[PDB]
Structures are given as C-alpha cells and as structure tokens.
Design a protein around this ligand. Structure first.
Ligand SMILES: Cc1ncc(C[n+]2csc(CCOP(=O)(O)OP(=O)(O)O)c2C)c(N)n1
Ligand SMILES: Cc1ncc(C[n+]2csc(CCOP(=O)(O)OP(=O)(O)O)c2C)c(N)n1
Ligand SMILES: [K+]
Ligand SMILES: [K+]
Ligand SMILES: [Mg+2]
Ligand SMILES: [Mg+2]
Lengths: 330, 362, 330, 362
C-alpha cells in the first residue's frame, strides 16, 4: 500500500507501543535530541519528552543495568546499544541480571525489557565494529533473540518484543535501515504483530532449502532469482527468530527439497549455521537429505578495512550460488 | 513498671558535601526496642544455624553469613517504609528476613527444598521478596539495578525510594561510578550504601582501594559515614537519607562501618588475612545485639529476664525452621524447566541429550 | 612414577615459566597473599614477590585491560579470572583489545597474554556461577582457546599457552583441580609442552568415536569402560584445544568407526558439539558416517541450585551411554 | 635579525590536589617554534585532505578529524621523549604523525592501500607506530591499556612514562575509574589525559556528566586543567606531568580544553547540537596555528614570509602524499588472511564457503 524503510518501520513500532502503554520508554546514547545515531528514533523525543525518551552518557554496563532494574520494578524499557559490538561491555547485565532472573527467582521476578540496535557487518568500519552477535546471544537460556530482515519483520518483531514479558534481543542491521519495502495496510495497523519463534518462507521452492537471517536474506533471494533462470527453484527461509528458532519450518522444507544450505554474515565456527546443521542431523529431516548440508558464512578473520578484502570477508551472491551448485552437483 | 520510651545520644556522622546531617539524639520506644531486639537476634541465630547445617552438608555451594552486621539490615528496615525498595549483593539472609520472609522459607531455600522461597532453584545468593530484589552474585551488578529501581520510583511518583547496597570490595567496580553519574544527572531517589566490613573476600581495604573513604568515592554525590554496629545510628541516618531523597534532592551515599565475624564464606576460615584477636575485640566491644541490650536495660525500657525470654522463643523459632528445612522434600524433577519465561504458553526444554525433555510452564 | 593433582600441574607449569623468563607475571583477585581463590597459585607470591604475583581489586575490565597493555609493551602477563562467569565484564578487552590487534595492525603489534581460570559447572553454585564459555571464545578469530582435562593436559597447555605470542584462553575446571593423576617423567620435565591445536586419543576403539573436552572426558572414559564389558569399543578423543580444533584427528577416527557422539558440559544451542557436527557433515568423513552424529550437553536452562535438579542439568555417564546405544541402535 | 628565543605568558592551570602547578611563563626558541608550526600545519592540511578524499569516496567507514585540536598532539609530543609511550582513541591522525609516521603511510592507510601503515587492514581508527599503541575504537578501552603500558615501564625500570588519552564523552566509562584506582594503588607513571572538546558525539558535557570538572574526576589522583588551544601551555603542562611521573609520585590527570571544527565524524554535519557561530567564534579567536603564528611574528622569532613558505612546503608534501595514496594499489586478495597470529607456522583460513581458502602467515 506504501513504501516504508526498515528504519521507519521500527520507528512506527516504537511510537505505537509508547502511545499504548505509559510504562514503555526508550533510553540510550543519542536516542533523543540527536534523533538517533542512525535516525531510528527520529521525532520520538519531540513527541514524548524527557521522561519517555532518554539520552544517556557513554556508560553501557551502567545504563543497561538501570534499564534492567526499571523493568524489575514494573516499567518496560527499550535499551539501545549504538551497535551490538558495544554490548560486550554490558553483556553481564543482559545475561546474569536479565535472562536468568525469572528462573532463579522461581517465577517471581519477570524482566520485561528489550535490547536493540544494529548488529554485524556494515561498510568499512573495520574489526571492532563489524561483529555479529547472533550465535552468542542465541546460546543463552531465558533470553529471546530475533533478527529482522525487512520492514514488515522489523515493525512486527519490535512490537512483539515490547509486549513480551521477558528479555528480548533485537539484532538489527545498519545496511538495511535505508531499504524501502512495500508496506501492506495490515502492517500499517497499530495492532500488527509478528509472533516470536516462527520463521517465514520468503520464496517457495522445490530443489533446495536456503535458510538465512538479517541482511543476507536479500542476497539469498537474489541468488534464487539468478538460479531460477537456470531451472533451479530455491525455497528461501527467513528465520526471523534466532532463539527459539523455528526448526519445524526448516525441517518441513528439507523434507521436500532434500537439500540445505545455510547463509549467515557472522563467523563460521560455533555460528548460527552450525546449530541448524546439527539440528538437521539430529532431527527427522536428516534421512530426507540427498547431500550434506553446507554453510555460507563470513570469512574466519577479524573484519579487514580495505574494500577488496572486506568484500571477500562477507558472503556474496556468487558464494551462495557456488555452494548451492556444489550441493546439487551441477 | 517500665518506661514507655527514652532518649539516647548517637554518634555524629562524618559528612561529604552536606550542610547538616542526621540528629545526634533520638527517641526509642519500649515497643520498638523489643521489636528490633527480637529481629536482630532472629537473624543472628539464623546465620549460626546455617553455619551448622553447612558443616553437616545440608547446605551446598556458597553460603555467606552476615552475623555481626545485624544493626545494618534491621536498622535500615526501621528507617524505611514497606513500600520503599531495597537491593543488595549475596550476603543477604538478613535482608531477606527483614523484608518479610520467614526463617523457614529462607533455611528451606538454603537446603534446596521445594519449600524454599525460590523453590530451591536459587540457593543462598538468590532470594526475592516484596520490594526486595536480591540477592545478586555478580559483584557490582546490583548497583545499576538499584539505580534503575530508583528511576521507576521517580517515574511512578509515589514518593518511594530505593536503597542500593554494595560492599567495600565492590566499591572499586566501574559500573558503580557509571551509576553515580547517571543517578546525579537525573536526581534519582537512590540511596547508595557501602557496607564496609573492612575486607573484600581476603583483600583488606588498604590493599584494594587507593582511598578508603568510601562515603566520598561518589565525588559529586553527597554522603555520610555511619556507625554500622549501632542500630539507632543506622535507623537515624536512614531516616535522614530517605527524607533527603523523598524531598527530590537526588542520590546520596551512606557508608556503614560494620564487621563480619565469619570468613568471606564457608570455605574461608578467615584468619589468613586477619587475626582472631581482632575479631574477638570487635565482638567484645561492638556487637550490635549487645549494644542494644545494654541500652534497653540501662534506660529501664526492658528487663534482662525479659530479653532472655525473647532469646528462648527465638532459639525455638530457628530450631523449628531448621527441622522443617531438613525434612522438607526436594523440588520434583518434573519442574526442572519451570519458570524460564513469564506469561508464555508451556513448551519443551532439552535435557542432557535430545531424548530428555522437560516441560516448562511460566 | 609421581602422582600430581590438576591444581598442582598448573602450579608447576606457571612456576617453571616464571623462572624461565623474568617478563612473565601473574595478576588477578586473591592470586598472591590468599594463595589463590582455589589455591592454584599457592606459594608463588612467597617465592617471587609483589612484582611478579599481583593481587588486584575487584575490577575485571580494568585489570584485564592493564594486562593487555603490559603484553603490548613487551611483558608476558597471565591474567586470572576467579571464574570465567566474571570474564563477561571484561570480554571486550579479550576480544577487541587482544584477539583482533595483531591483524588490525598488519602484524606489527602482537599480544602475548594468557587468560585463565575455572570454567563451567561446579557444585551448587547456581545460575550466575555455572556458565561454560568454550563456545563463545572459540568463535573468535585471533584467539586460541584450550580446555584441559587431566594433569598432563593442564601443565603442557599452560606452558604452551605462556610461550605462545598471541592471546590464549585457558578454560580450567574447578571440579578437576583436586583430582590426582599418574604424572610420567616426561611431564615432570621443565621442557614439557603440549602443542596447541592437537587432540589426544585417550582410548583406542573401533565401534564409535566419542569426542569431548574438560571434565566430561573423564565421564566418557567411564562410559567406555562400561560399554567395553558389553563388547562395544569406544575411541575417546580429548580435544585439548577448542580453537583451532583438531578436526583431522576426529575425522580420521570417524573414518574408522563410522559413528560419532560429542559430549560437553555447556548449553546445547550454538555449542561446541554443534561445530563438530557441522564440520563432520561438510568434511571427507561424512561418507563414512553410518548413523547421524548426536550431542550430549548440559540441560538448556540456567543452572538450578537444588542437588537433584543440578545433577540432571549436566551430562551423566548414563546419558553418554544412552546416546551411544541410540547411535549404534543397541 | 631574528630573535633566537623569546618568553611567553601562558594561562595558569586550575589545580586539584596540587600545591604548585606548571610555570606561567616559558621560553620558546626559534628552532622549536619553526618545528611546532610546521608540525601543526602538516596535521591541519592532512585532515583537510582527508575530508576531501572521504567525500570522493576514496576513504570509507569512519574518519574522525582532529583539526582544531592540533595544539594537543604537537604540544604533547613537544613535552615528552621519543622513548616515552602514548595511546589514544580513534581521532588519532595527528598523533600518528607526531609519533613518527609519514603523511604518506597515514593517507595510504585511510585509502586502504598496500602501502598503508597497517597494510590497509585497519583504516582510520587502527594505526600503530613506535611507542604509539593506537588508535582504539571502543570508547574507554584504551585507558586500562595505557595503565598497563605504564606498568611495563615501571616493571622494566626504564624511567619512561605513558600518556593515556580519552575524550569527555569517554570520561564516564566505568573502566576509567577502575584504572584510576589501580594506577594510584601501584603508583604507575601514567598520565591520564582527558581531551575535552565539549561534546561526546552529539551530547554536550553538561547533559552527559553530573560534574564537568574532568580534571577532578580522578578524585584521589591529582589533576590540572589546561588550555588545549595553546601549544606552549600544553607543552609546559606536559613537561610538568611527565616530570611528576618520572619522580615516582604515581599517576596524574590532565584535562586539555580544546575544540573540534568538524562534526563527530564525516556523517555528522555538527550543527544539530551547536551553532555555526559557536564554531567560527572559536576559530577566529582560538585557532592553535593562528595563535602560534601571531606569537612568532610579534616576537620576531620568524617572519610572516618564512611561515608562509613553510605552508607551501607542507601543502606540497600533502599533495605528493595524497597522489601516492590514491595511486597505490590495494593489498592483494591473496594476503587477506595474513597476520592473524604472530610467530606461528603458516596455516589455512576459511572464506565465505568451505571451498574458499586463504593462506595465513605471521
Ligand atoms: C565481577 C565479579 N568478580 C569477582 C567475584 C568473586 N567474588 C564474590 S564476593 C567477592 C568479594 C566482594 O567483597 P565485598 O564487596 O567487600 O563484599 P562482602 O562479601 O565483604 O560483603 C569476590 C571477589 C564476583 N562474584 N563477581
Ligand atoms: C563502548 C562504546 N560505546 C559507544 C561507542 C560509539 N562512539 C564512538 S565515538 C563516541 C563519542 C565519544 O566522545 P568523546 O569521548 O568525547 O571523544 P571525541 O570523539 O569527542 O574525541 C561514541 C558514543 C563506542 N565506540 N564504544
Ligand atoms: K520484553
Ligand atoms: K600467550
Ligand atoms: Mg567487604
Ligand atoms: Mg568530546
């Protein structure tokens, strides 16, 4: 019905939840008067004021901890990390203070909080600013982890994230913020919600299952477009949730295609693809495989600066196509 | 036959960026005195019992005791409302009780039984109660949390405050300073409290902190140093600090000078870094229960036999709770996965291998 | 002969490296006068003094960064984290300041540093004190990660760790510290070194390959002894190194046994076993696998306190045997 | 005709826990003045060139410019020895040059070429040189590192010191306070330096810090506030702090009050949180190069014609360097995996898929 960028979709989601529940509030570095480091929170401070949209000092462990305490007390904070690379300084509060508390308290202390911000590779930001944290967070019990790709994913997941009464990590993508998508009236509604824990088939297919999350989803669709011209039909699956991942949807797809390729932007060892592949081998879909499942990931090095090096440190469409052809043996 | 109340003189607090501090005189009623006495004694006997149960292998893992610091948890409670909030570290058995939990529920949690306040899922370091947020095992992590609870108090506008406790060892944690800055910046009704018992596990304050004046580490945040062995000093300083925050003046730091009779925890005899004589001297001259007792009797607020009767009832209370905690069954294995998430539909959690499944209900 | 505990083996290793090079030094909470939180550094302060064995305040991010700086300046620091649960507060210094620097600097600035301490589950320490970080650290390029099981492992790996000129994470185990093992003359030598990146076959077998690391290795050997009485011979492989893992040794074994089971104490999703299972499927040994590889891990929940609950949150010998029989259909 | 030296007055530094501070007068020789002028002007033209290249997309990602702050990198260098050490954050182009690298190696790194000082592997934020440790991208992370470099100086007994720089925004990082404590505890020859250019990205100091007296945040550590726009003032304070540290008195804080002409980085226009009139007022009244130039001409240490000739030589050096930086080839793809580990035999690293292998040599 209309063109909406991922950035604007997230903004709509937050704006709507703030209007709906007075207990919701946003805090982080440059989220208010600066209109957001990547302009995701633009206009919110002007509309809601100092009490609801809070600019913070550069003290990650501290404001993440404050956010968790406010949640324990009954509020529903949205804690933004400029990039998740910086969340490493505050990762103890996310894991030991937020994720484990409901369980440790025997179901007495819930923690309704959301941690969001860009994750993974960007453009020429080098090693300390290009790390993907999907596998790290998805590894921890008591936490829910999502990684939206397009505008619909973004709005639907942030709203659901905010209404959930447990800690939810929303791993966004800086390169996706400015990408426009066709936004249907259903997504425009203030009641639009995407369930956490359910994957989405972005393209129906019969020759091979291609699973991914975040930005790479777009490259998988591009790869599918190219392969389609050669008679190869790819079923592209958008994970949406990292924890708890929707393995049922992936297994059902493999039972039809007999082939699987995983695509992620993060480092290979102990990554997202590793878990999917291990789950496939432990599940009922293993016998439906006609070829071993293979993984497309970022190169196993800290992210280099030079253009040509960075380009070969992140999965390209040609790398996705190459792996798919190896799997189908064509 | 007994005086209804009496006036007592209390030590003046050292001040940091404060024009005036709490009064140096306070009135104690016979009713309150008897109450604080029973409370401190209950905590003391509970810790001694936990020590006994630990040696008997009934309690496992960590077990940090607070005997010697009873004037702190009871004094702080006496100076705040049931609707105010409090959070501390792992040496929290006393606070759990003063905040409303029974000795039975506390000991049952230590022995890891279903009747524990946390259903046996948390143990010694993790216990929660109404407006009591633990009970936190990561040194320093509870400070930003406390400032967050203070943020909610201001946000709700009910005039409630939050007491955020941390030890001298934790005082050197970077996140505490990040919390000082934001609390001052936003004038949060947070009472930062440093429980100074002189040692951080095995490291004395002199060897861990370049400056041992904890009540001033906040720098721009005002503070006061209190005698943490005198319950009336603690109560009065607490009323002052709470009133300060309720008036909208922002955060304040309060240093409680106390002492712990036991080692850091059960596995630490506590004599490799300090002498037995030092411990004995403190007990002999500054024990919190001894101090209040002498005040009660010397002022005719109560009789020695009356206080002895309370000791007997308290000892009886602890023995009954200990029997309950030792006989109460362990939680059922079928509930191992319960309470991972709140307000969600039930789901399955994986065990030691893919063929082991546990049900998880909110 | 000579029998030595794991704790003693580690102490021997550090002591020998300290004597060998005056630039080597140890720092951490209670490492000096307290003789070590778990007594691993016992006697070292008395022998070397305040300059070589440094007690620190409780400031993880701070002393970890100080250690990294000292290493960049030419010293060879051994940084101790009381438990790795506490390394989360300083994980940014380990990853962004140490691991990635040699690469980012174009090979100009090396970081010869060692990060050690107990990792994983203990006995009754609850949720915030039982986390395993093998998967988290082994995920990062620029780091080397080892996880010793017995006394030989411990001594040889700590010495190799100290002599390496890059950041090395040594994930120890508190429950293993007090366990004694026969210490051969070879290991007694001050020249005893275990190469990082090479696994060790602890037991030869022909029916199935059982890979593990740290404490569970002992449980696998126990499981193998029981199965041996039934006619089943397990080839137990002690990883020793988490990154870079010795997949070659594992593949060679699977090519002989046709079966594989991985055993680990940490959380299942995105864990150590996931990477091993994914590599086996992508490698030359996949065609030799007669049954899918299965994983034995800790339960997917924050660690509970109650004895019976904790017993069922970590892998037991019976769980290893069950998985093995399920794999061999017996 | 030219004076060989002249005396100048410099602003007295505000002091924290110090009886006496740096002198309020100093001597500048003609030779030193000529060197400082050329150095600051080289940094200025290099940054302006960097700006131009970025707009042309020749430089990517981050690019934090330090123009306006030249009295800091040159003044700091003028007050230490080449054998001393220094570490800072990401706004490090100036420091990389003052520490010894050529404009050629710096620009080639920014343009991501083989001849870059880091071989095109690091870019704008990660550059290293002899006794210069970056060039660090995580706010505050470099402070503990500097303290560690200082520990090494003491450990090896070399009589060298380490300057550890961080911005006003970074001053609220918890790890900085953890470092203050240990540095004072072990009397490390560490000079903590807060470059205060008034804004943390887009947040003014008044909105980010409860207390804006950065030189006093060290609390127990002494400090001095310095005019960061005056090259001589910075040099004098630096010589004072370095001497303080070499004497074995431990750490000291130095707040340099400066200003950045450009926004936080290339994508920040720099006018949403401050007015254009504020920026220009600072430039016309306090530009570091203008101030030195006026001093040298007035005192007859150099002629306006001589200084102009230096500008011409510098401009050409910059242009010849930019030509090399834009013509120099990118690093070969075959070396993508090089330098992952030091002193190790060669090995293979995985690329985007299992069939892509890169060789890795130390
Ligand atoms: C971040 C972190 N580092 C280290 C530890 C280990 N530890 C637990 S208690 C403790 C001593 C803290 O002493 P203090 O804050 O003075 O409190 P006390 O027990 O004396 O009340 C230490 C080092 C921890 N739990 N968390
Ligand atoms: C831990 C962390 N948090 C946030 C960021 C994002 N960031 C990079 S520079 C910056 C501003 C720092 O300002 P300041 O310390 O004053 O230095 P300046 O650039 O003004 O010299 C911020 C918020 C980061 N790199 N690291
Ligand atoms: K939530
Ligand atoms: K090393
Ligand atoms: Mg203490
Ligand atoms: Mg600044």
């Amino acid at each position: 019905s209309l063109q909406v960028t991922v950035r604007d979709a997230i903004n709509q989601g937050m704006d709507e939840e703030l209007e709906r529940d007075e207990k919701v509030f946003l805090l982080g570095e440059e989220v208010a008067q600066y209109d957001g480091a990547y302009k995701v929170s633009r206009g919110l401070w002007k509309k809601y004021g100092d009490k609801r949209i809070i600019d913070t000092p550069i003290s990650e462990m501290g404001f993440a901890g404050i956010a968790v305490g406010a949640a324990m007390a009954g509020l529903r904070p949205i804690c933004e990390f400029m990039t998740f690379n910086f969340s490493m300084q505050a990762i103890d509060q996310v894991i030991n203070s937020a994720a484990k508390t409901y369980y440790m308290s025997g179901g007495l202390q819930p923690v309704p909080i959301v941690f969001r911000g860009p994750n993974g590779a960007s453009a020429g930001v080098a090693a300390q600013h290009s790390q993907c944290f999907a596998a790290w967070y998805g590894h921890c019990p008591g936490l829910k982890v999502v990684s939206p790709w397009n505008s619909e994913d973004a709005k639907g997941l942030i709203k659901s994230a905010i209404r959930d009464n447990n800690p939810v990590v929303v791993l966004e993508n800086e390169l996706m913020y400015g990408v426009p998508f066709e936004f249907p009236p259903e997504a425009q509604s203030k009641d639009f919600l995407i369930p956490i824990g359910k994957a989405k088939i972005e393209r129906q297919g019969t020759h091979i299952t291609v699973v991914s999350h975040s930005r790479p989803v777009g490259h998988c669709l591009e790869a599918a477009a190219v392969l389609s011209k050669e008679g190869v039909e790819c079923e592209v699956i958008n994970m949406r949730t990292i924890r708890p991942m929707d393995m049922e949807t992936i297994e059902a797809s493999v039972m039809k295609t007999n082939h699987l390729v995983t695509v992620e932007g993060g480092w290979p060892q102990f990554g997202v693809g590793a878990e999917i592949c291990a789950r496939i081998m432990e599940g009922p879909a293993f016998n439906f495989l006609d070829a071993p499942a293979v993984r497309v990931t970022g190169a196993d090095v800290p992210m280099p600066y030079a253009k040509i090096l960075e380009d070969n440190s992140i999965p390209q469409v040609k790398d996705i196509i190459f792996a798919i052809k190896k799997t189908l043996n064509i | 036959s007994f005086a209804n109340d009496a006036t007592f003189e209390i030590k003046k607090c050292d001040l940091h960026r404060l024009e005036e501090g709490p009064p140096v005189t306070t009135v104690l009623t016979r009713e309150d005195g008897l109450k604080y006495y029973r409370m401190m004694q209950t905590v003391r006997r509970m810790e001694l019992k936990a020590d006994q149960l630990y040696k008997q292998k009934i309690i496992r893992g960590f077990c940090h005791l607070c005997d010697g610091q009873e004037a702190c948890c009871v004094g702080l409670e006496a100076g705040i409302n049931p609707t105010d909030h409090l959070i501390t570290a792992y040496r929290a058995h006393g606070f759990t009780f003063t905040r409303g939990l029974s000795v039975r529920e506390i000991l049952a949690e230590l022995t890891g039984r279903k009747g524990g306040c946390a259903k046996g899922k948390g143990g010694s370091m993790h216990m929660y109660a109404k407006n009591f947020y633990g009970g936190n095992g990561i040194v320093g992590a509870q400070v930003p949390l406390g400032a967050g609870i203070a943020l909610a108090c201001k946000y709700n506008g009910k005039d409630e405050v939050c007491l955020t406790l941390y030890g001298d060892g934790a005082a050197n944690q970077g996140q505490i300073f990040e919390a000082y800055n934001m609390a001052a910046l936003w004038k949060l009704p947070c009472i930062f409290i440093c429980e100074n018992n002189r040692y951080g596990m095995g490291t004395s304050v002199e060897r861990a902190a370049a400056s041992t004046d904890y009540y001033k580490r906040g720098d721009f945040i005002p503070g006061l140093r209190v005698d943490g062995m005198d319950i009336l000093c603690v109560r009065e300083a607490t009323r002052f600090a709470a009133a300060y925050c309720r008036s909208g003046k922002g955060p304040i730091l309060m240093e409680l000078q106390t002492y712990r009779y036991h080692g850091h925890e059960m596995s630490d005899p506590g004599v490799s870094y300090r002498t037995r004589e030092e411990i004995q001297e403190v007990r002999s001259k500054s024990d919190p229960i001894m101090l209040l007792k002498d005040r009660m009797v010397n002022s005719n607020l109560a009789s020695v036999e009356e206080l002895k009767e309370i000791d007997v009832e308290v000892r009886k209370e602890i023995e009954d709770a200990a029997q309950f905690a030792t006989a109460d069954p362990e939680p059922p294995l079928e509930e191992l996965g319960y309470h991972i998430y709140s307000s969600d539909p039930p789901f399955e959690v994986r065990g030691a291998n893919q063929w082991i499944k546990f049900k998880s209900v909110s």
